[PDB]
Symmetry: D2
Subunit: 300 residues, 4 copies
């Protein structure tokens, strides 16, 4: 009755830093990479026979090798290359999930011009991709999720919250003016891999930020829906977008005990607890792709 179920394995958090230096004007790619293979690894679990298993150490080596041989431009393309490579190398594998985070760098400003080889981290969120490749030859299927994590944004007005359901345990007062502060985590799924990854990423990021700032918010739920639907409207190549946003409470401090007023000016930025508002915006007219999301954000 007892059997092995779902399983996957690979190398997590391979930090690879790639320099392009064909000219004195260097460029950098600063990545954190996860590999996970799926397939027939039953004996490796049940009996200990490792014949099917490519070591995770080799998967790490492959990241560094392909960083040179294939290069690193868009992380989506690097992830697709890695997935197909592992399927070529590991016959027992049925699929590969490659996840990548990119940390952006700007050139250090020297007298108004960016320096040739000196850089400063941009520090405004992490660009992400989750690429799943399954099968080989005519049976190969691939899925790309892209996203942004740790994008810390806030609005100091243009946020309300009223008309909610009131309970015998509700103390929160309705309001027409509050701070709305979050750290956005989001992933969206592409319908195909015929995408200009950098162009679309930059556009999606701008839409998310513009909608957050300019949409008068009646709830974080409604802000997220407006952000996500704007992305889908502008990008028909995107099938769905998931958004997970903490409501990082900035509490208006009561200054009456100190003889002072506080007309929306002085706040306590509380760490925990925080509202956590999570929503998916989807194209109803296209098929779902659960394969793309399997074990995202994690296995268990």
């Amino acid at each position: 009755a007892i059997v092995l179920g779902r399983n996957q394995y690979g190398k997590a958090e391979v930090r690879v830093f790639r320099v392009y230096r064909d000219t004195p004007r260097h460029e950098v790619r600063d990545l954190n990479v996860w590999t996970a293979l799926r397939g027939d690894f039953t004996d490796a679990h049940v009996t200990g026979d490792q014949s099917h298993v490519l070591p995770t150490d080799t998967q790490k080596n492959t990241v560094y090798a392909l960083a040179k041989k294939e290069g690193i431009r868009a992380i989506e393309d690097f992830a697709l290359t890695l997935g197909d490579h592992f399927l070529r190398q590991v016959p027992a594998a049925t699929g590969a999930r490659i996840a990548i985070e990119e940390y952006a760098w700007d050139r250090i400003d020297v007298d108004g011009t960016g320096h040739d080889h000196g850089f400063v981290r941009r520090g405004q969120g992490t660009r992400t991709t989750v690429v799943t490749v399954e099968g080989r030859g005519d049976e190969r299927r691939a899925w790309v999720l892209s996203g942004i994590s740790d994008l810390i944004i806030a609005k100091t007005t243009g946020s309300e919250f009223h008309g909610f359901l009131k309970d015998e345990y509700t103390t929160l007062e309705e309001t027409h003016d509050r701070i709305l502060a979050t750290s956005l985590h989001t992933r969206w799924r592409y319908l195909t891999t015929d995408v200009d990854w950098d162009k679309t990423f930059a556009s999606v990021r701008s839409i998310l930020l513009r909608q957050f700032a300019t949409v008068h918010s009646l709830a974080l739920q409604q802000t997220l829906y407006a952000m996500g639907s704007a992305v889908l409207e502008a990008h028909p190549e995107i099938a769905e977008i998931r958004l997970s946003a903490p409501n990082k409470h900035h509490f208006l401090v009561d200054l009456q005990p100190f003889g002072l007023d506080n007309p929306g000016e002085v706040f306590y930025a509380s760490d925990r607890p925080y509202g956590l508002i999570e929503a998916s915006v989807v194209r109803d007219d296209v098929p779902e792709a659960p394969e793309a999301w399997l074990a995202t954000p994690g296995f268990c």
Copy 2:
């Protein structure tokens, strides 16, 4: 074509500390609680009408209130109570997911006896539960996952890794003796809620640790399978167990450049990258319950 998809919302990371003090011998319950409601919250997203929405601030209040009114013994029972409470209070909700972490405390030792009201954190992993309650009356269904996170364990021998698939990118040497060090994250699903939560948790924890230590390991895959299957064999009330284990590499340092040998004695404990080995052990004869795992470990 564009619509709201899956969504959930609630209060994350409510830190509640409950003291039992009916006698001078105090007891403590130190919890971190997440609430998330699912249901008909479409208008709250699409139009901004919050009529269906119970504020996350109220969900936090409810945690503190029920900590007194219902008490906190086993976290599974507290989570079940919270889920049913929210379904009573929020008619638009179809379901509730309550996740809880517990941090264990020991009594401070005073001359051989634990002190009445002075405590020290135990610091050997976090006990967890994820409880999902859906529906009401005769249609109510509930699911309980329990687990352990951040259980840091290692063996200094009794670990091999050889006979693996070798690639043109493989540099790793086969070995019959290595350190196997991990931080275990695991969750298991109960078949019913007629369970002695504390008794079963303690037994499962002991089985996991005993099997890790005493099973001669030919791979982390095989160690995890032996751990998980032992749990299922001893606990027929458990339907499945998922295990996610990093292989935290302790590298045998080359001391030959310094005129020294190193017969398995001096190691460099590397942070990243790390192998990440993930496996599920399941009862083949019982139905799956995907409802229990939805949005575990997270939404996206």
Copy 3:
């Protein structure tokens, strides 16, 4: 023979968020504040008599009250105000140390123009101050340190390390080209409080970054000295600057086992260990001020 020695107490990590909203173009001040008082607090330790002790809860309240009553422009001036305020209110105090971190925000870009009230974290290090105020009236003395923390910068060339002391345990090869990557932590001391804080901070920041990028580095030691001395040369109002810089190693990966060369292109970004290079650049012609540095970065 046993007595109370040095001691200090206060409220740590008061997160205050101040909004300036007299016009629709809001401005933000996002601060983390520490207070610590020194003085005659002996009985509070030895006998338990708290008569001299202002609660740390009150110190927290004071941060919020004065954020409204006095406002928050330059954090140096807010810290000076807080220290003088505590000396007025706590007769037993002989001194106050006020430390502040500021997290910078940019306006969200909306079609080329920054939004009136929507912001995104800048994410390029933390501006800091440590202000010590001692005494009252004609006997009052004050000292201001300002600084930058977590400024993550890297050069991909223009860094060498050769000609070093050799030793039987040395395996490192000399090199004329490497990456130099760090996270800069620095504090400098002002000779007086008659300083345009914002103008000098911005200038010091630019000098540090410009020197890091443009100085050909023969060692992190020499890079830090060139950075610090350039600051002192440009700013006669600064008495000394201390710099603490990890050398976050980016290791050139050996790709020969994979049939590839690696002409300074593919690197492994290692977490730990890291070189830690720490240096002070000082004006030899002005007196030291150890009072300014007492319990920086911490008490023990």
Copy 4:
């Protein structure tokens, strides 16, 4: 006028894991090591000449080499060995500061008996040492600090706070019963190196915990003084002890809005801000040793 001031350099956070395996009952030493050398390193900063400089990479190698050649028993003795070793190898050095953290492991319990080679982290704070060695031959001086960090302890009663200085900004009510929760950070200085390090460490740890639990607390100040003075009374070989303790507030939640009372039972465990109470207990009859504390806890 501009010169190099104080400076030090070395390798930070060398994670060394030492196994003692001369018999089947293995023992573990799990260390994090910092090295910092001081001396005549001026030209290395000012001119870039590295002739005096031993690479930090070599300092890392030395940790691993001496972990085998000398072994690792008490971390105080390993730190002393390392400091003397660097002074022998680096003629320009005048001193060495070696800091070590140790993470304790227990044996996994297998049916009542600890396993020969399977371990679980103890998780109850970090044992630390800071060893400074200056000079050579008859001029050599050494100082040892030892300590405990991240020892998380709490009392649920036996703590009061009343009779404090009142002030116009005070909202805190006096109380005769509260929780006192902290994470203890402490270091003490030994008068000589003729110390049974393990025996004294275990005794000091027990005294700190016993005094915290059994001393009726009128203030964290008074609790820390009672802890420190008890250590000095029991250990004439200890010259001084510094303690830094956050007051991690557990707030009694107001349950009156929910129709419930709360007789000291339900608390909100707040993250930030926190009181920070720091005190030194010293032997008035012995000389100070500022050399032992230089750049503890850090350089700037």
